[PDB]
């Protein structure tokens, strides 16, 4: 019942990324230092590379929660510029007015 299949793929990515966040954080710490032996750090490089692709946080996209637009989204409201303006221009967003100066 999500807006489209693209939103649905991002919903699964956000869920998988959450499930693997701790495991990924622990393995990365082993890699992001010069203290541990390079042999151990090389095994960690393979381990984090073998985790499912959709667990990588960089693959998450901030899409509009109402229309699924991947660009023109305001992060504070999570709305596309077209959807935000529709609500703001109707006086339905508390405290947001047209700017004139």
């Amino acid at each position: 019942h999500y807006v489209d299949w693209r939103m649905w793929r991002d919903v699964k990515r956000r869920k998988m990324a959450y499930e693997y966040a701790d495991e990924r954080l622990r393995i990365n710490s082993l890699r992001k230092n010069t203290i541990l032996p390079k042999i151990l750090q090389d095994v960690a490089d393979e381990e984090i590379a073998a985790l499912p692709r959709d667990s990588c946080p960089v693959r998450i996209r901030n899409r509009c929660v109402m229309t699924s637009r991947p660009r023109g989204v305001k992060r504070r409201w999570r709305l596309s510029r077209i959807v935000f303006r529709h609500l703001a221009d109707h006086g339905q967003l508390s405290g947001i007015q047209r700017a004139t100066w």
């Binding site: 701790d22 622990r26 203290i35 541990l36 032996p37 151990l40």
Partner: protein
């Protein structure tokens, strides 16, 4: 329950409705406390900040000690994790290094 019914009457005014909600736990209790109902397992401040007790199983000296000292320093500065979550991080490292002892021995690092 029958004794509650005999004293039961409809809400008489706005204040009474607020009182009923407060007693039921629906309405917030004032003055507003931002930590109302949240206790981190009654953990003391020393539990969060001092985490070296958990590093006893690890080697007293060496690269692993230095690395784990950095891990605990970050965990001690984390206000978003409970004490239980912080111990989980350290425990995972105890297991990980136990599995990689062969590699650590090749690097002249003695673990346990």
């Amino acid at each position: 329950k029958q004794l509650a019914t005999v004293n039961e009457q409809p809400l008489q005014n706005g204040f009474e409705e607020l009182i009923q909600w407060t007693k039921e736990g629906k309405l917030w209790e004032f003055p507003i406390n931002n930590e109302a109902g949240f206790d981190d397992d009654g953990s003391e401040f020393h539990e969060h900040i001092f985490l070296e007790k958990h590093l006893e199983s690890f080697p007293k000296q060496g690269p692993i000690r230095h690395f784990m000292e950095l891990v605990t320093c970050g965990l001690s500065k984390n206000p978003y994790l409970s004490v239980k979550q912080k111990v989980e991080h350290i425990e995972w490292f105890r297991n990980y290094f136990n599995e990689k002892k062969d590699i650590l021995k090749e690097s002249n690092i003695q673990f346990n």
